[PDB]
Structure formats: structure tokens, C-alpha cells
């Protein structure tokens, strides 16, 4: 295991600057006490966390009782696909009308719910119809509640575009985050768009994002970015901690019973320079998911 792990880390771990020290320490550990996968995992996990403080980097073994399947993920989300988008304008409007639920709550508070993030190629096709369903009806409102408590996310490709409806229309765009993918040399700065289709909500009106423990992937990134940019108040539960920033590497060591290592290959550096380690968005106002809408209304009322 140790040999495969050091190789996997050197080539794929997001924080390349920690590799020299890891290569020094890992081979120097006392391994004459461990003789089971579970022990090897636990021992290396304790040492890796002491050296890295990165919870995304974790050795995990299968259920020891059924070693063909383990705690290595489930499966990538299935949202609306670009090859399945209707051609007819009436059908496209109708589909947008069921994807996005928009209400004007008493006191002129906008409510927006949607429960997936589609790829930006899909949002491109739906954009003209989203103007009618979302962006125009909420223009009258002075505050907006975005409900993501039922949103398990999807691709993050349209997250910069969506965020830009809550930003200044002008140029230059605002820096959202920077990606550093170790597997290559990404260092790609991600910016807002200078032009959106339909009316932006703007940067001034109050925005409140509702979260649950089921909130996942792109929805967590959208919530985190609305928080990191100080654009909205996050309300609800700590989110699922499922971001698409890691890859799973099996240990071909069958004596070690079905082990694998999940390695962050991507570092997400926000606009304040903070590295986000995922594990869940932490709300500004932590409440159970059922209480989040009430709490957002309270915050609005007593502003």
C-alpha cells in the first residue's frame, strides 16, 4: 500500500507543496503494529490528517464482509441532459416552468426553488424561457429566497453564469474562485459573466439561500460562493460535503482486502484567497432544514 500511496499522492494530490514532507514522514512511520486493512487505513489516515489537515484525502476500505463493493462513492448525478432537451418552444417553456418554482411571498419576498444544476449547454437552450419563469417575475421583489434544500446539484459548469445574475452587469467581471487541478496545471481563474440573458436581480437586494444536508455538488458551490462573496446569507443545515474535486484510486493490494484512497486533485481558492476543503457549506444561520424558510423571513422582517 505505502508504495502505491506515495506514488498516487506525488502525481495527483492537489497540494503538491506538501509532497516533499509527506515523502519524508510516511516511510519513517512505525508499521510493525498494523496487520489488517482497517488498521492500515486508520494508521495512515491519522498520519495523513496530522500532516495535511485535509479531510478530503482519505483511505477507505470496502465493507469487509462484501469486498467487491465499498464506501467509494455512489454514482454521478443525472440532471437534464443536452441530448434530451425538446425543440418545441411551448415544451421548453413548460419544462422550465416545472424546473423552477417561483412564488411572490407576502411582504414582497421572492421565492425561487430549483432542485438541480444542469450543464451550461442545457442552460443555454433554456435561457430565453428562464427569463419568463424566473428573472422577470422576481424583479418586483425587494428580497429573494433561493431554496436549495432539495437541490442535489449536478455539473458546476453553469454556476458562474447563475451567480452573475446577482452581480454588477459591468466590466471587469468579478473573480469568483480559482481552480488549481494538480493532475495538470489548471490555475484557472473563474469569473462572472459581463452579460446575462434577462434581467439580473442585481447586487443590492437581499438574498437568502436555504440549505440542507442533502444540498450537493454544484448547489454547494453556488451557496458557498454566494457566501464567500458576501452576497447572500446562508440559512439551514451543513451541506452534504459532496464536491467534484477528488478522484478515487484503488489499491491493487488485494491482501489489503478492498482498500482505496480518495485524493483531492483540485484546490478551490475563493475570492478572499481561502482554500475550501469542502466537507459541507457551513450556514451563517444554522437551523434544521424545516426551519430555514421561517428563519429567512425572520431575518428579513427584523433587518
Amino acid at each position, epitope marked *: 500500500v505505502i508504495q502505491r500511496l506515495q506514488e498516487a499522492l506525488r502525481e495527483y494530490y492537489t497540494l503538491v507543496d506538501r509532497v516533499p514532507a509527506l515523502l519524508s514522514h510516511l516511510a519513517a512511520m512505525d508499521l510493525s503494529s498494523v496487520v489488517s486493512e482497517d488498521d492500515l487505513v486508520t494508521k495512515l489516515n491519522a498520519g495523513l490528517q496530522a500532516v495535511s489537515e485535509d479531510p478530503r484525502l482519505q483511505v477507505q476500505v470496502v465493507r469487509p464482509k462484501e469486498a467487491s463493493s465499498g464506501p467509494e462513492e455512489e454514482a454521478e448525478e*443525472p440532471p437534464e441532459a443536452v441530448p434530451e432537451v*425538446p425543440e*418545441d*418552444e*411551448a*415544451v421548453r*417553456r*413548460a419544462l422550465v*416552468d416545472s424546473v423552477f*418554482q417561483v412564488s411572490v411571498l407576502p411582504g414582497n419576498v421572492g421565492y425561487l426553488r430549483f432542485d438541480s444544476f444542469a450543464d451550461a449547454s442545457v442552460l443555454e437552450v433554456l435561457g430565453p424561457y428562464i427569463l419568463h419563469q424566473v428573472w422577470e417575475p422576481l424583479q418586483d421583489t425587494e428580497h429573494l429566497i433561493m431554496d436549495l434544500r432539495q437541490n442535489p446539484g449536478g455539473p458546476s459548469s453553469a454556476v458562474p453564469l447563475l451567480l452573475s445574475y446577482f452581480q454588477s452587469p459591468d466590466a471587469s467581471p468579478v473573480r469568483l474562485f480559482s481552480t488549481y487541478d494538480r493532475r495538470t496545471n489548471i490555475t484557472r481563474e473563474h469569473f462572472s459573466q459581463t452579460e446575462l440573458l434577462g434581467r439580473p436581480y442585481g447586487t443590492q437586494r437581499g438574498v437568502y439561500l436555504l440549505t440542507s444536508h442533502r444540498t450537493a455538488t454544484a448547489a454547494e458551490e453556488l451557496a458557498f460562493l454566494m457566501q464567500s462573496l458576501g452576497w447572500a446569507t446562508l440559512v439551514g443545515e451543513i451541506t452534504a460535503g459532496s464536491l467534484l474535486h477528488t478522484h478515487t484510486v484503488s489499491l491493487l493490494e488485494t491482501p489489503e482486502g478492498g482498500l482505496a484512497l480518495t485524493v483531492p486533485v483540485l484546490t478551490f481558492i475563493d475570492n478572499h484567497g481561502e482554500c475550501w476543503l469542502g466537507g459541507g457549506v457551513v450556514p451563517d444561520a444554522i437551523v434544521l432544514a424545516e426551519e430555514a424558510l421561517d428563519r429567512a423571513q425572520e431575518v428579513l422582517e427584523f433587518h
Partner: antibody, heavy 122, light 110 residues
Framework: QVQLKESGPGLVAPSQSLSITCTVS????????VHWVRQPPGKGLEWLGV???????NYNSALMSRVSISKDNSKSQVFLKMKSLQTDDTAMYYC????????????????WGQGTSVTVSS | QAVVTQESALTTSPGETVTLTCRSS?????????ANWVQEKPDHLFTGLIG???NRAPGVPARFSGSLIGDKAALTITGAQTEDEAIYFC?????????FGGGTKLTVLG
């Protein structure tokens, strides 16, 4: 050719459950969605829900809680489960195909099944 | 809410033009509601006539047309025939659900 046939229990008791099957033929469920519609005696039509090709479902909000739709791609079957029956759930239950691959995008219920009569009584 | 209403009964005679309307409780009917018109024939024979406001299904007679008349969807029968005597249902799409109207009972004299 495109056909939809419903089959259900006929008689069901108040406060119990209802399960109906829509068997389709002439088209694949992996490519087409299916809607469930009901017609209470001497009433108009009422939409219950749809299950799209990709598996997403949408429900009439009024029913939302008591209804559940599912399918079997390989089997060419769509199912509707309805709970907490009251005698006002007495109706002709229909399945209809969902279609949108037109010249201009629009959703349409293009082919309708023949219906199945459900009597909710004690 | 999202209550669709239609006239409940209309009567015509062969060769005349009749217009059936469909109204949304929520506001003006738009293209995005994809008005569908379904025909009910004795002993629950349902046939889709028009989809997406104005698209006549291929097997339907050319005398059936659909349009947006102001704030409502309309089904016009130009030169009504005795076999047009049926119940006509209107359905409107509201982004995540369909809502059917009450139906119009059309009587054709002669």
C-alpha cells in the same frame, strides 16, 4: 403501433391503496414520458402526473403526497400507486404518451390509453 | 390557483364557425402554456387535436385551428360537422404541471 393499456383492481376500499399499470407498446419508455389522468364520474379530466424518459416525475400538487409513479423500461410498464383512498377517488384512470419532438418545441399528450375504471367503496 | 376555465356548453349547426375558449386563472395564456385541445367521444375515446397552441395533429381535419385570442387560448372549428359534437378539453402547462379545464359540450344541430 403506439398503444397504451391500463389494468387495475376494479374494486378498492376507502383508506386503502390503489395500484394500476400502464402497459405500452409501439414506443420505448427509455425515449418517451407517460402521463396519468383521471376522470371522476360526471367530472372533467384531472392530471395526476408524468414520468419522463430519464425518470424524473412531476405531480399535481393537490395529490403530490398520496401519489407515486414509477416504471419498468425493459417491461414497458408504468405504475401509479395512490394512497389514502376516499370514495371520491372513484374514476376512470388513463395513461397518455408525452411528446415534444416537434418543429417548434411544445409538450403534447399525443396518444391516449382506453382507461380503467376503479370503484372506491366499502 | 391555476384554474383553467372553458365555456360549459355551446351549440352550433353544420357549416357554421364556433370558437371555444380557454382561460387561465393566473393571467394571460401565452405560448409557453402550450395549449392542448383534447376531444372526448362517447365511451371515453380521447383524441389529441391541437398541441402547442396551434399545431393540428396530423390525422385531424383541416377545419380545426387553434390560436391565442387576446389573453386566452381558442379552438376554432370553421364549417362544423355533425361529428364534431363532443366534449372538448383544454390543458395548459405551468412549467412543472398540466391543468385541464372543465370541458365544453358542443352540440351540433341538424
Amino acid at each position: 403501433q403506439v398503444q397504451l393499456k391500463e389494468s387495475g383492481p376494479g374494486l378498492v376500499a376507502p383508506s386503502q391503496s390503489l395500484s394500476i399499470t400502464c402497459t405500452v407498446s409501439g414506443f420505448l419508455l427509455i425515449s418517451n414520458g407517460v402521463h396519468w389522468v383521471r376522470q371522476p364520474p360526471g367530472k372533467g379530466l384531472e392530471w395526476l402526473g408524468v414520468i419522463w424518459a430519464g425518470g424524473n416525475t412531476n405531480y399535481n400538487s393537490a395529490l403530490m403526497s398520496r401519489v407515486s409513479i414509477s416504471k419498468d423500461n425493459s417491461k414497458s410498464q408504468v405504475f401509479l400507486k395512490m394512497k389514502s383512498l376516499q370514495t371520491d377517488d372513484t374514476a376512470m384512470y388513463y395513461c397518455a404518451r408525452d411528446f415534444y419532438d416537434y418543429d417548434v418545441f411544445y409538450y403534447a399528450m399525443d396518444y391516449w390509453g382506453q382507461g380503467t375504471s376503479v370503484t372506491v367503496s366499502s | 390557483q391555476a384554474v383553467v376555465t372553458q365555456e360549459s356548453a355551446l351549440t352550433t349547426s353544420p357549416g357554421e364557425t364556433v370558437t371555444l375558449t380557454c382561460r387561465s386563472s393566473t393571467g394571460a395564456v401565452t405560448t409557453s402554456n402550450y395549449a392542448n385541445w383534447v376531444q372526448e367521444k362517447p365511451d371515453h375515446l380521447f383524441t389529441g387535436l391541437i398541441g402547442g397552441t396551434n399545431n393540428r395533429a396530423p390525422g385531424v381535419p383541416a377545419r380545426f385551428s387553434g390560436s391565442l385570442i387576446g389573453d386566452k387560448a381558442a379552438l376554432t372549428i370553421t364549417g362544423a360537422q355533425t361529428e364534431d359534437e363532443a366534449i372538448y378539453f383544454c390543458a395548459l402547462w405551468y412549467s412543472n404541471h398540466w391543468v385541464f379545464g372543465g370541458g365544453t359540450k358542443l352540440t351540433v344541430l341538424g
